[PDB]
Design a protein around this nucleic acid. Structure first.
Ligand SMILES: [Mg+2]
Ligand SMILES: [Mg+2]
Lengths: 61, 122, 167, 197, 127, 106
RNA sequence: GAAAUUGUUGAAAGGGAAGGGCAUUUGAUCAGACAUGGUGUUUUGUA
RNA sequence: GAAUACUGCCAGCUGGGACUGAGGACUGCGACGUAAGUCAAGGAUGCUGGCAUAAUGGUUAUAUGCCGCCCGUCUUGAAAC
RNA sequence: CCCUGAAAAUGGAUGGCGCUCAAGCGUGUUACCUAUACUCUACCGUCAGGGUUGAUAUGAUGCCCUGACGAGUAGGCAGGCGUGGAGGUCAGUGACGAAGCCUAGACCGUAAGGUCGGGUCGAACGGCCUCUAGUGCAGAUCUUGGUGGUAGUAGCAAAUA
RNA sequence: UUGGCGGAAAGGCCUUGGGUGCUUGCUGGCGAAUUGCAAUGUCAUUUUGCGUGGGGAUAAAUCAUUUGUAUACGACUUAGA
């Protein structure tokens, strides 16, 4: 037995791999997950996380 | 099917205590036995080596009447009829012999032991 | 179709194993086995018989002989884990055992077709036995009762505790 | 080590002997216990008579025939004490208990055999000198055993025959010891003495 | 003739049967979980039946493999059989139960020509 | 001679158990002659055979063998623990069994 | 032409229930692997 | 003037026994070696025998050892008289 | 410490047998037994952190590396199994035998389940991607229908024969 | 084979005489292999059947009838060449 100080097996709670079934959006997140993995620039990670977002978390600009 | 029937001395032949004389059943069974013996002589059997090889009784569909019980109730009064079949055969001789070949598997140590015994004795 | 397909088939190419690191150093025998020791055969066809040990072979086996004149045990090889090294010692200097090796004992393996339904010896083997045993028995004749000891069999009597017995 | 072990029950303590013997049967040794009338129980005779009367009170109320059976013979008292220590309601317990037979006296199958003792159940080795003890034959004939005197008469006859045996055995062994002493101090005797025999 | 594999181990080769399927005839022995509040099987008392759980899962290198070492693939005709032409050492064909005998002889002939193993080469055969 | 025994007799006592749960994978063996773990340490690693008979002849014999080995000592009185390829059938509690002297190290 | 329930035959067990879990004995019953490419032709239908 | 006990340390030596062999071209850290190379250094190989079949094994019935109270429900609490 | 004080109703319980320099009480020292606990290893799943669009061949929700974790009623969520019907596809199966049913015969899945062999049978049915619902039973003194033990039992005895 | 003894569950113990075999008390001669480096490597006693060939002996019980010292029925007690 372990005296657990946290909740075991919990999800991170941050959405990855967006819930949409748009194939062009999936191509875009494939391109930007390559760029975020290997270009070591923070911009690519920021736009990769922004690509996952839902509609109310993407307000019009 | 013998619970709470009377006890009698004539069950000593079969080592039981509970025995009866079901006359209607004996009439039906011996009518079927007579018919089977007639079928056997029609088929051309020996009529002296015959023993009853097979017999079975199972249940026919019930026949229902009504029974009148106290405080105006109805119950069933059902007959349980029978299907009976039987087969008489000639008593034949001994059945068969000459069983399977029973091929043997022996290790090299067993074969060497048998060869050693056959060498060491006559 | 009955079954549809697998979307991916596993590859049929078999991979090579990794490069092992298990070299073979020679067997380090136990200290009670020196050549010339009288052994007791624990298992086998000649179990309970006392033989003399001659040479440590290549495949970690011990070359032994009866001698064949004494108890009828021929020139043979046994496993070192299936003998008891007794304290009785004879000298086997004067015996040329370098002729025997692992290729000297070949079984000439049998095919699967040749099945023994119901049912011989090498002449080279029989005069090799006759050469070595006449050199052993000359060393046997020095101390008394060794021929009788090697002819007699070993067995456990009632009250024999092998953890207390010294061989 | 033995096929059958014959235990002389004289001077033994009932519980300690029963706990030895029950483990022997469960391990698979065949045991026959003779002279069950000479077992000993520690304590006063009046204490053990009161104990047996307390046991004798216990019976099934609505039918005494299906109650606990109070056996009166010393061998059956020993059998009760041993069946308490064997798990007798299983097949292993029944197979163990069929390796045991207990007798008053020494019957003719076993009067010509060798009797042993159990030194960790002997009264002279276990009890402090001064403590009082009972004899199982006396207690059993106090609570209802009918055959105490016929066993005594048979045991007297058997002891007379056994003394007649032992006189001849002693004479023969004195002859053999005399011949061994006169045939000692030869060369084979000195070689055996050097080798330890 | 199969691909080399590790030794196939089943963590629980016994079939999980529903509690009291031996007791009552109305209770089938397909597995159902006991949702009762006093159930000894649900409470996992000693001496009762064991329940299916994820720890009994087969090895991923060993899963879905027959004792011969192949995976069963159901086939209905020669075109379904021909999909296993380049994968003979990993898959073994099994003729479907509803194929007639005069088609079964054709599928067996083509599988013997292509070297494909058939796991039931004895169905509807006359002799 | 009249004796040909090249093994030590032993008795199959029981399984490894607690007060109310047994474990058939480990059997308990009483080797005769030994009464202490220091003498029982000689017998570790030795092969054990349980030899029994059957009515049906299988491969030339009506005698079947179950093989195992001594693994460790048990208790203070020379009982040993033994493991077999297939576990002993538990009706053999109190049955005789053979401890051979190989694998040898003397 | 299912099940409850029943008859016959066959097999098995049964000292105040029966049924179950782990393990093995015994009896009965049963699947799989056993060719492989191969130096080779000691060869026939000559490849 | 010593020894020994007790406690503690050794990157001292060495014997027996049990369980496990996961991974699958190479890459790393090391050691012995002047070097080639070798090795117990990022997970088992070498040699040999028997059998090649119901022998191992699976299933099923039985036997044995130990364990196992009737399910669902309300309830603080159900095997519940 | 032991004894007297010390009396309850079926027969009775340091768990039982039994135990008296204990197998009792006080105390001390060792050895030993074994939990689903601890240590190491393998496997399953979950979670987390990473690597890997290069060409060839597939699946980037893929493959691979590393570490930790796993109790659970009420309840929540996720991934799946099964049924009736609908769009598409396999130019699917089938009177040389579809569906159904029986089978202490075999195989796969942790499981819901799936597949095969044999028997019976006689006319339709299935895999995959999706759509839809009158979609999964052991219970409700559930509904309808059928059948047991009780049980060859209670009984078939008023009104003279 | 002669003579005893043994009734607790004796079923065994002792003894006389001759025959026959072995003798490792001592000294010799010949054989053994190949079961291949181990595989219980098979040697015990318990019951039954069927054959031989050698002795031994030629019954009762139950149903049915009857009795009434008995009796719900079974059972019991009687009788019957
Ligand atoms: Mg009426
Ligand atoms: Mg059921």
């Amino acid at each position: 037995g372990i005296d657990h100080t946290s909740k075991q097996h919990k999800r991170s709670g941050h959405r990855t791999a967006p819930k949409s079934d748009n194939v062009y959006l999936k191509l875009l997140v494939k391109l930007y997950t390559f760029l975020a993995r290997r270009t070591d620039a923070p911009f690519n990670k920021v736009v990769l996380k922004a690509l996952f977002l839902s509609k109310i978390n993407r307000p019009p600009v | 099917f013998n619970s709470s029937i009377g006890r009698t001395a004539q069950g000593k032949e079969f080592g039981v205590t509970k025995a009866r004389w079901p006359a209607k059943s004996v009439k039906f069974v011996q009518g079927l036995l007579q018919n089977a013996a007639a079928n056997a002589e029609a088929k051309g059997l020996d009529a002296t080596k015959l023993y009853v090889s097979h017999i079975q009784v199972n249940q026919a569909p019930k026949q229902r009447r009504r029974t009148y019980r106290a405080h105006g109730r109805i119950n069933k009064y059902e007959s349980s009829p029978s299907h009976i079949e039987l087969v008489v055969t000639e008593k034949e001789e001994a059945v068969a012999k000459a069983a399977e070949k029973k091929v043997v598997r022996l290790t090299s140590r067993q074969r060497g032991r048998i060869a050693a015994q056959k060498r060491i004795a006559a | 179709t009955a079954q549809q397909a697998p979307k991916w088939y596993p590859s049929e190419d078999v991979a090579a194993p990794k490069k092992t690191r298990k070299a073979v150093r020679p067997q380090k025998l136990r200290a009670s086995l020196v050549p010339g020791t009288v052994l007791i055969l624990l298992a086998g066809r000649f179990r309970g018989k006392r033989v003399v040990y001659l040479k440590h072979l290549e495949d970690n086996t011990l070359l032994v002989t009866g001698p064949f004149k004494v108890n009828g045990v021929p020139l043979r090889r046994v496993n070192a884990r299936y003998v008891i090294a007794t304290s009785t010692k004879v000298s086997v200097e004067g015996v040329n055992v370098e002729k025997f090796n692992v290729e000297y004992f070949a079984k000439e393996k049998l095919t699967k077709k040749e099945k023994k339904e119901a049912n011989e010896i090498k002449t080279e083997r029989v005069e090799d036995q006759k050469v070595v045993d006449k050199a052993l028995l000359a060393e046997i004749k020095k101390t008394p009762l060794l021929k009788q000891y090697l002819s007699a069999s070993f067995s456990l009597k009632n009250g024999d505790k092998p953890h207390l017995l010294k061989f | 080590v033995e096929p059958v072990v014959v235990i002389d029950g004289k001077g033994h303590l009932v519980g300690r002997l029963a706990s030895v013997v029950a483990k022997q049967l469960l391990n698979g040794q065949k045991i026959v216990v003779v002279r069950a009338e000479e077992l000993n129980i520690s304590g006063e005779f009046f204490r053990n008579k009161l104990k047996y009367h307390d046991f004798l009170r216990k019976a099934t109320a609505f039918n005494k025939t299906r109650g606990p059976f109070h056996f009166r013979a010393p061998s059956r008292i020993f059998y009760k004490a041993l069946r308490g220590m064997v798990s007798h309601k299983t097949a292993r317990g029944k197979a163990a208990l069929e390796r045991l037979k207990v007798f008053e006296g020494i019957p003719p199958p076993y009067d010509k055999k060798k009797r042993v003792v159990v030194p960790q159940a002997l009264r002279v080795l276990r009890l402090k000198p001064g403590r009082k003890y009972t004899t199982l034959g006396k207690l059993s004939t106090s609570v209802g055993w009918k055959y105490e005197d016929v066993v005594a008469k048979l045991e007297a006859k058997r002891k007379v025959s056994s003394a007649e045996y032992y006189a001849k055995k002693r004479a023969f062994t004195k002859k053999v010891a005399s011949a061994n002493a006169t045939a000692a101090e030869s060369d084979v005797a000195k070689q055996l003495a050097a080798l330890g025999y | 003739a199969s691909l080399p594999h590790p030794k196939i181990v089943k963590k629980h080769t016994k079939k999980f049967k529903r509690h009291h399927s031996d007791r009552y005839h109305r209770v089938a022995e397909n597995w159902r979980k006991q949702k009762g509040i006093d159930s000894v099987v649900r409470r996992r008392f000693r001496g009762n039946i064991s329940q299916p759980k994820i720890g009994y899962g087969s090895n991923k290198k060993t899963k879905f493999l027959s004792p011969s070492g192949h995976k069963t693939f159901l086939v209905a005709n020669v075109k379904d059989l021909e999909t296993l032409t380049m994968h003979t050492k990993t898959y073994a064909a099994e003729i479907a139960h509803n194929i007639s005998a005069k088609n079964r002889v054709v599928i067996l002939a083509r599988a013997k020509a292509l070297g494909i193993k058939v796991t039931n080469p004895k169905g509807r055969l006359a002799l | 001679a009249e004796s040909h025994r090249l093994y030590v007799k032993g008795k199959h006592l029981s399984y490894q158990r607690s007060k109310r749960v047994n474990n058939p994978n480990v059997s308990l063996i009483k080797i005769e002659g030994v009464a202490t773990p220091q003498d029982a340490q000689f017998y570790l690693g030795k092969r054990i055979a349980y030899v029994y008979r059957a009515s049906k002849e299988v491969r030339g014999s009506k005698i079947r063998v179950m093989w195992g080995k001594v693994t460790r000592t048990h208790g203070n009185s020379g009982v040993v623990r033994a493991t077999f390829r297939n576990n002993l059938p538990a009706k053999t509690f109190g049955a005789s069994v053979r401890i051979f002297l190989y694998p040898s190290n003397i």
